[PDB]
Write a protein that binds this ligand. Structure first.
Ligand SMILES: [Mg+2]
Ligand SMILES: [Mg+2]
Ligand SMILES: [Mg+2]
Ligand SMILES: [Mg+2]
Ligand SMILES: [Mg+2]
Ligand SMILES: [Mg+2]
Ligand SMILES: [Mg+2]
Ligand SMILES: [Mg+2]
Ligand SMILES: [Mg+2]
Ligand SMILES: [Mg+2]
Ligand SMILES: [Mg+2]
Ligand SMILES: [Mg+2]
Ligand SMILES: [Mg+2]
Ligand SMILES: [Mg+2]
Ligand SMILES: [Mg+2]
Ligand SMILES: [Mg+2]
Ligand SMILES: [Mg+2]
Ligand SMILES: [Mg+2]
Ligand SMILES: [Mg+2]
Ligand SMILES: [Mg+2]
Ligand SMILES: [Mg+2]
Ligand SMILES: [Mg+2]
Ligand SMILES: [Mg+2]
Ligand SMILES: [Mg+2]
Ligand SMILES: [Mg+2]
Ligand SMILES: [Mg+2]
Ligand SMILES: [Mg+2]
Ligand SMILES: [Mg+2]
Ligand SMILES: [Mg+2]
Ligand SMILES: [Mg+2]
Ligand SMILES: [Mg+2]
Ligand SMILES: [Mg+2]
Ligand SMILES: [Mg+2]
Ligand SMILES: [Mg+2]
Ligand SMILES: [Mg+2]
Ligand SMILES: [Mg+2]
Ligand SMILES: [Mg+2]
Ligand SMILES: [Mg+2]
Ligand SMILES: [Mg+2]
Ligand SMILES: [Mg+2]
Ligand SMILES: [Mg+2]
Ligand SMILES: [Mg+2]
Ligand SMILES: [Mg+2]
Ligand SMILES: [Mg+2]
Ligand SMILES: [Mg+2]
Ligand SMILES: [Mg+2]
Ligand SMILES: [Mg+2]
Ligand SMILES: [Mg+2]
Ligand SMILES: [Mg+2]
Ligand SMILES: [Mg+2]
Ligand SMILES: [Mg+2]
Ligand SMILES: [Mg+2]
Ligand SMILES: [Mg+2]
Ligand SMILES: [Mg+2]
Ligand SMILES: [Mg+2]
Ligand SMILES: [Mg+2]
Ligand SMILES: [Mg+2]
Ligand SMILES: [Mg+2]
Ligand SMILES: [Mg+2]
Ligand SMILES: [Mg+2]
Ligand SMILES: [Mg+2]
Ligand SMILES: [Mg+2]
Ligand SMILES: [Mg+2]
Ligand SMILES: [Mg+2]
Ligand SMILES: [Mg+2]
Ligand SMILES: [Mg+2]
Ligand SMILES: [Mg+2]
Ligand SMILES: [Mg+2]
Ligand SMILES: [Mg+2]
Ligand SMILES: [Mg+2]
Ligand SMILES: [Mg+2]
Ligand SMILES: [Mg+2]
Ligand SMILES: [Mg+2]
Ligand SMILES: [Mg+2]
Ligand SMILES: [Mg+2]
Ligand SMILES: [Mg+2]
Ligand SMILES: [Mg+2]
Ligand SMILES: [Mg+2]
Ligand SMILES: [Mg+2]
Ligand SMILES: [Mg+2]
Ligand SMILES: [Mg+2]
Ligand SMILES: [Mg+2]
Ligand SMILES: [Mg+2]
Ligand SMILES: [Mg+2]
Ligand SMILES: [Mg+2]
Ligand SMILES: [Mg+2]
Ligand SMILES: [Mg+2]
Ligand SMILES: [Mg+2]
Ligand SMILES: [Mg+2]
Ligand SMILES: [Mg+2]
Ligand SMILES: [Mg+2]
Ligand SMILES: [Mg+2]
Ligand SMILES: [Mg+2]
Ligand SMILES: [Mg+2]
Ligand SMILES: [Mg+2]
Ligand SMILES: [Mg+2]
Ligand SMILES: [Zn+2]
Lengths: 63, 151
RNA sequence: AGCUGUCAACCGAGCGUUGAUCCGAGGAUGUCCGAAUGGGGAAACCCGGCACGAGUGAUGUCGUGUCACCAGGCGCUGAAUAUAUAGGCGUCUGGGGGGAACGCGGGGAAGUGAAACAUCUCAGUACCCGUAGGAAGAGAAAACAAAAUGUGAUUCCGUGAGUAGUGGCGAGCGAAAGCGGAGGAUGGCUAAACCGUAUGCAUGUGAUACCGGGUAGGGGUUGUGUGUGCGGGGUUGUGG
RNA sequence: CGUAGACGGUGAGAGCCCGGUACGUGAAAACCCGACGUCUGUCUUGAUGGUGUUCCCGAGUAGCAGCGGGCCCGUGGAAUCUGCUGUGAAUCUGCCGGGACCACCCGGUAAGCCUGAAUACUUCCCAGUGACCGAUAGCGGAUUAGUACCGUGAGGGAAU
RNA sequence: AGCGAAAGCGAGUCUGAAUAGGGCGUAUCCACACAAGAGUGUGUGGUGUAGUGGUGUGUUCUGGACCCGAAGCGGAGUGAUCUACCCAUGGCCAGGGUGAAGCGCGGGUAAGACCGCGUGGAGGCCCGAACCCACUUAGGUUGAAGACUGAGGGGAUGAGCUGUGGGUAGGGGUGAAAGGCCAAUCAAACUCCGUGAUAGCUGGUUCUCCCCGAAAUGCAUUUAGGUGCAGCGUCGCAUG
RNA sequence: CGUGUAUGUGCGUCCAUGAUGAAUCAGCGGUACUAACCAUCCAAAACCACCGUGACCGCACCUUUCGGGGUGUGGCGUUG
RNA sequence: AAAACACAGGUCCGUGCGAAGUCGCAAGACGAUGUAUACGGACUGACGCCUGCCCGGUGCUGGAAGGUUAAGAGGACCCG
RNA sequence: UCGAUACGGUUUGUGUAGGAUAGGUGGGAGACUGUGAAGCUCACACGCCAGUGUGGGUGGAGUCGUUGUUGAAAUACCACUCUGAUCGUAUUGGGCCUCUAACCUCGGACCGUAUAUCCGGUUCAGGGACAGUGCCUGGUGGGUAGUUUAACUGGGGCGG
RNA sequence: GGGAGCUUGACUGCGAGACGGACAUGUCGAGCAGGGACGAAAGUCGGGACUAGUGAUCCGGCACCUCUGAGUGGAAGGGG
């Protein structure tokens, strides 16, 4: 669960650095949540993964 | 976000009023249910909420009320206005559910919802008289003979 | 004017001024496997459907087509379930695999060096992944510069310069501005505001409505509001 | 003889023996180039500089913060660029940059898109060249060469 | 053109309160003066100052860097046809003993217990071939064989042996556990690549003659068989 | 295992023959998924009484009289 | 080839159920088409008689009146 | 339920020179009755209980001032007000019991679907703003990984 | 070496010339000037009869200064 189904926002890769400056590779993952949204006004619901940015911007209608 | 109410909500506000609220309503309770709306343009959203208050409060129905409305719409031929040339009598567009709910308000009179008119199974787009079914409850059903005139 | 590729000759036959062998161009045929795609499979071998012919006294048998999966257009239908959708049927058009290097975007070591080692180095290297093109990427200022009435998109090359810096200030790493050049296209087009239109969704005041106006008459771009598409109109920094 | 004395071959060092060389000539068809027309599109129911305000100028963006990446710059006083997360504006007496920051000045006009040339490379084809090798050399491979052979396999791999 | 951390000043400059000493700088030499013999200074004249760019040689820096050599580290792959364990579906186990429960009869018992007799055919039962192992010993020990052979030896209806097909993969698998086994290799398989890994360690480094000619000590050292600097060799220049 | 041909019995589509099980008209008796209804399990909001306070204090009050502390009832009040 | 491993028997601990445990980044799988008389882990090792003391140390489990402690909220006061 | 804010109305000040339980005030010759105050009845307010402001039940038609002492006068009135015992509104936190609508269920049914213990959907039944998951954050952490763990020395170690 | 008086030279700017030295360290020093102490003056005084009582560089703190200040003025930061 680290790709948005709407905008394709995937993880990023960086380093976690300790106090001894001991860097290791890790991921910044997107905040994608399991949304269950409607494409029609009527209200038939299909389950997708949407990052919270897309939920906030109202790109998915969870009617 | 900030919305405009179309209905009354207890401990929130009155219908037609512009109310600021958390995004829980504008995502999970109010916006799906239609008892509010996104407030876009002031006159626009005010008119939309007030107007929808008028239609919703009139498209309400009950079971005996539904039987009464079926008796009301057991009337005659319902005339409609959609473009179609007499060259082949072929209707280019798809005669929308609004075009039939308004059509029966013009012909007979009773008001109703586009939800209840079974448009997909009419086999539209031939010129002449055609039958369309309408359903309000589990059992009640009304048959409407709808036609068009030449253009 | 000789030819029947060659090792690689011997036999046996033939062709050639009526232009062969040979060379260049365009075509035809092109078994089976292979992305391999009718189904299956231990690659090159096993088993079919349908259509049109062939052949048999009939089955058997043969020939040629066609039949994968996905993605997108268009048409038909619309489960649970009413709106409907998911799906299903048909008809098209593409995709798939390969490739030495060069490109771009990602993931990313260790040996080693530091006379040990962990920051650091090695090195964003090796390798991996996704994708190209004949090149790519970049590209038309929300830039530099420094008080000069200065440059003017990008890319690349030389310097600046092993400098300023940076660094367990260790081993090490290391610019840019400016300046000289190759090239030229200091190249183009939209969005928005307004105007017109068409359509969709909530609506009629169902009536004095919109229309550039005066006159007269009819009396609905539904009056309206909004969203979308299309067309004008705009395309900027002394702001336009 | 020479606009040909490049280079090979021929029974040993050949300009005049052969193929050629200098120099000219040649394409039916296919393909790559230009050029002239059909064709395609646009511009002209129309131009120009003035005089004074309202609207517009790319929004879940900029900026801000947390944790990172990258810049000469290893977190440093650390700007510029950038990812994930949270918060989150204005439309020009705006907003961004000029190495924390502030004021003034100057430069520019982000969150829309296209774009040739100068630059990198060679699987393959053509033509050449070498104070390059000359059969333990040069390609692993002048000859059965990725062959024989070795390995279950990735793979290794001759000699003549 | 230098001095200064720098602003800066400039044959000067820095420090400093100092025409008061010192630092660095004013090519170099000559003379004549003026001051002290505390090592010479100061000043007036004179002379006037040498760099740079090709290229040969020596040494050096960055590169595999004079050549050869590890055990091992990393990336991506290949292997369960040997072996370890498991999964499906099959086959095999000469011959002979023993004699469990259960059942039946009798005795004995208030009734039991139990015993004797029979039928009965149990069992990780017994002896022992095929088959599977591998305890002892002798031979082999440039073998017949990269683990055998001879003579004996344990199991041999079972936690048995075995065929065919299949599954588990490398910091992983599997293990009735020995760090065993995972293709004659296992305290981390093999192949290719990083890669010409790195080795203060060992080895090797190819023609001649002429002149000169050491050291094996001091100091410091994550140092003690390594290195830096001194000492000690050679060549060039200066002095003599 | 298929296949074709010719003949034989020979059931049959049609006739016809049987078997046939019904329904409507209307007289009805319960069998009904449909209120209201009853029994069952649980507690909606709820008092009483016994017994304590989670802490404060008025306490039968005790310990070198009072050092510290504390067995035990009560009211404010409830871990109740 | 053993005295070592295994073993039938013993106890302790975990697990209320796509359990716990394990393989996976996840999905999913085994556990198990099992359900505490079951499953996993640890030690012991047929049978018979038994298994003393120590809870200070270190783990495990449980508890909370206090002391201490991150990010996050706060922004008094100070500086440009 | 408690806390922080802004706003409204009661309400407060032991003092001695005294007709003073002397809030800091700007305006102060004139404000308070029968919309029933005086003086009686109680509570609200405190009480260092020395004494005073509100109501109606009674009550009858007034009390007051630079009055004079009193630093500061009315304690007769409008507008500003710290100390306090207070309620309410607007706003925002901490907690609590909840609700369902996000989200969740390997609980049932039905459908795509001839075939299906996948998957998706629809719907009933349950949880429920918790859990899970992003981001930030403190713990535990040989489960794993990379590494370090001096030299001299009559061999090395142990000692020094 | 013992005793008393006064007092801070347990100074600031420097330093001819040297000892010792792989280097880095280290050690002595007359004399000049400022401003002082003691002494009538001569003069002595840059800690202690002498030789131990110490730790390079990096990095950072603090006080002072007339240095710098990334367009400019400040600041931050750097510098002495
Ligand atoms: Mg996905
Ligand atoms: Mg990175
Ligand atoms: Mg590293
Ligand atoms: Mg939000
Ligand atoms: Mg030909
Ligand atoms: Mg051809
Ligand atoms: Mg095929
Ligand atoms: Mg296939
Ligand atoms: Mg399709
Ligand atoms: Mg339908
Ligand atoms: Mg491709
Ligand atoms: Mg490393
Ligand atoms: Mg090293
Ligand atoms: Mg080394
Ligand atoms: Mg090019
Ligand atoms: Mg391009
Ligand atoms: Mg450069
Ligand atoms: Mg680097
Ligand atoms: Mg337009
Ligand atoms: Mg347009
Ligand atoms: Mg301008
Ligand atoms: Mg020649
Ligand atoms: Mg813009
Ligand atoms: Mg960085
Ligand atoms: Mg930075
Ligand atoms: Mg582009
Ligand atoms: Mg060779
Ligand atoms: Mg030879
Ligand atoms: Mg070879
Ligand atoms: Mg082979
Ligand atoms: Mg200098
Ligand atoms: Mg000094
Ligand atoms: Mg001087
Ligand atoms: Mg010269
Ligand atoms: Mg030279
Ligand atoms: Mg390896
Ligand atoms: Mg394999
Ligand atoms: Mg028996
Ligand atoms: Mg018996
Ligand atoms: Mg046995
Ligand atoms: Mg035995
Ligand atoms: Mg036996
Ligand atoms: Mg025997
Ligand atoms: Mg035997
Ligand atoms: Mg064995
Ligand atoms: Mg033995
Ligand atoms: Mg022998
Ligand atoms: Mg023999
Ligand atoms: Mg033997
Ligand atoms: Mg034997
Ligand atoms: Mg078997
Ligand atoms: Mg297999
Ligand atoms: Mg193992
Ligand atoms: Mg092998
Ligand atoms: Mg082996
Ligand atoms: Mg390994
Ligand atoms: Mg290893
Ligand atoms: Mg390397
Ligand atoms: Mg080497
Ligand atoms: Mg000699
Ligand atoms: Mg030396
Ligand atoms: Mg020398
Ligand atoms: Mg044994
Ligand atoms: Mg043995
Ligand atoms: Mg053992
Ligand atoms: Mg047990
Ligand atoms: Mg235990
Ligand atoms: Mg689990
Ligand atoms: Mg238990
Ligand atoms: Mg034991
Ligand atoms: Mg025991
Ligand atoms: Mg015990
Ligand atoms: Mg004990
Ligand atoms: Mg204990
Ligand atoms: Mg304990
Ligand atoms: Mg304890
Ligand atoms: Mg605990
Ligand atoms: Mg904060
Ligand atoms: Mg949550
Ligand atoms: Mg969380
Ligand atoms: Mg650990
Ligand atoms: Mg370890
Ligand atoms: Mg290492
Ligand atoms: Mg050592
Ligand atoms: Mg030693
Ligand atoms: Mg010794
Ligand atoms: Mg000895
Ligand atoms: Mg003395
Ligand atoms: Mg001192
Ligand atoms: Mg000196
Ligand atoms: Mg003096
Ligand atoms: Mg002196
Ligand atoms: Mg250092
Ligand atoms: Mg600046
Ligand atoms: Mg400045
Ligand atoms: Mg400063
Ligand atoms: Zn998204």
């Amino acid at each position: 669960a680290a790709v948005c189904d709407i905008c394709g926002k995937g993880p990023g890769f960086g380093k976690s650095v300790s106090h001894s400056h001991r860097r290791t590779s890790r991921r910044w993952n997107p905040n994608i949540q399991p949304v269950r949204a409607v494409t029609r006004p009527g209200g038939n619901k299909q389950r997708i993964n949407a990052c919270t940015s897309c939920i906030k911007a109202g790109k998915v209608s969870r009617a | 976000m900030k919305l405009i109410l179309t209905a009354e909500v207890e401990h929130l506000g009155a219908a037609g009023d512009t109310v600021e609220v958390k995004d829980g309503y504008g995502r999970n309770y109010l916006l799906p249910r239609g008892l509010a709306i996104v407030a876009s343009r002031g006159a626009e959203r005010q008119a939309e909420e007030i107007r929808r208050a008028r239609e919703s409060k009139v498209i309400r129905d009950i079971e005996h009320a539904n039987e009464l409305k079926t008796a009301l719409e057991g009337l005659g031929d319902v005339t409609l206005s959609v473009n179609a040339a007499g060259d082949t009598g072929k209707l280019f567009g798809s005669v929308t559910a609004a075009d039939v709910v308004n059509a029966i308000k013009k012909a007979g009179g009773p008001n109703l919802d586009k939800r209840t008119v079974q448009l997909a199974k009419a086999h539209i787009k031939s010129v002449g008289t055609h039958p369309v079914t309408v359903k309000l409850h589990t059992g009640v059903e009304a048959k409407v003979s709808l036609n068009v005139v030449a253009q």
